[PDB]
Design a protein around this ligand. Structure first.
Ligand SMILES: O=P(O)(O)OC[C@H]1O[C@H](OP(=O)(O)OP(=O)(O)O)[C@H](O)[C@@H]1O
Ligand SMILES: O=P(O)(O)OC[C@H]1O[C@H](OP(=O)(O)OP(=O)(O)O)[C@H](O)[C@@H]1O
Ligand SMILES: Nc1ncnc2[nH]cnc12
Ligand SMILES: Nc1ncnc2[nH]cnc12
Ligand SMILES: [Mg+2]
Ligand SMILES: [Mg+2]
Lengths: 179, 177
């Protein structure tokens, strides 16, 4: 058992029935508050991506909002820029947008039309994968820009919600798996 | 020239999200690794110089504040606490309503985010009217935290955000009218 993974796992805390009945909410806040834990999370993700893609990445894409907490740090670790995929209405200039559902509601994601040029290689990062709706919407938009999505990564994966399978055949990797 | 790497990576869009606003887009700073690194480094060096070893935590403001908070905290060897838009955080919370340049909103913080006395520097991407950053200071004030300083990448000086935070020290890398 990797001690690095334990530093992350030990800092996840759970709240039942938030924000709606029957949801078991995984709170990442303690990971951010513990510098040792955050550093471990970024390092583990970066190690995976370095080994899996050999540096052949152009940009990291961070997902509004909790994905914002990991995107830039991960990109910086890898020497890469970070592109923003945001909740609809937040980004200026020409955009594309897509509707989707997540575990406990629905929303719309959006990306600036000039965020990526055709052919550019991207890895998508978010804090947690659940139903995979949010990540799938991100992949759909990056596809509209003719970007190649190499992989999607998160800190946490809720495997009972089968988000992984929803993303196929786009590869996926998480640090931690809960039901 | 480190500052110029940041300066060169701000775009502007008139009348977004509403008429009368000139929107400063930070996307290009994030997209250019050298730009982003320069920004974090400039912020970190300022804070180390100003506060020595007296900062306990960085607090980053949902959402665009999240882009800088964790990086800045990591650079300084500190943890980052989250101040989120109301409704987003689990557990017992405090919240406060406020006006920003182009709308109204509400921020929230977890009651156990901080212990009384602990010293915090608040980070956000951009300071306009100062309403957001002020609301964040209020929330920290209710937890009896000591807010040492507020910082941002961009400051819109004609909106007098600095005066709303006074006498709390404020520092920004870039200034526009
Ligand atoms: O796999 P899914 O079922 O789509 O759920 C996962 C997504 O939902 C949450 O975001 P949320 O919409 O709560 O916004 P936030 O990031 O601002 O918390 C979470 O941060 C993921 O992005
Ligand atoms: O100085 P003020 O007048 O308060 O305005 C500045 C704030 O407004 C913007 O946030 P916004 O509410 O647009 O949400 P976002 O961070 O998700 O873009 C920006 O990110 C600052 O936090
Ligand atoms: N169960 C959960 N916990 C935390 N964030 C989530 N986003 C979607 N589902 C979630
Ligand atoms: N003029 C502006 N540009 C970008 N972000 C902002 N947040 C508040 N006012 C803003
Ligand atoms: Mg999210
Ligand atoms: Mg903001």
């Amino acid at each position: 058992a990797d001690s690095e993974l334990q530093l992350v796992e030990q800092r996840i805390r759970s709240f039942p029935d938030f924000p709606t009945p029957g949801v078991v909410f995984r709170d990442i806040s303690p990971v951010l508050k513990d510098p040792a834990s955050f550093r471990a999370a970024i390092g583990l993700l970066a190690r995976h991506l370095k080994a899996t893609h050999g540096g052949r990445i152009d940009y990291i894409a961070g997902l509004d909002s909790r994905g914002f907490l990991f995107g830039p740090s991960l990109a910086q670790e890898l020497g890469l820029g970070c592109v923003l995929i945001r909740k609809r209405g937040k980004l200026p200039g020409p955009t594309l947008w897509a509707s989707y559902s997540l575990e406990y509601g629905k929303a719309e994601l959006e990306i600036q039309k000039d965020a990526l040029e055709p052919g550019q290689r991207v890895v998508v990062v978010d804090d947690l994968l659940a139903t995979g709706g949010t990540m799938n919407a991100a992949c759909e938009l990056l596809g509209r820009l003719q970007a190649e999505v190499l992989e999607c990564v998160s800190l946490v994966e809720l495997t009972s919600l089968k988000g992984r399978e929803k993303l196929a055949p786009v590869p996926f990797f998480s640090l931690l798996q809960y039901e």
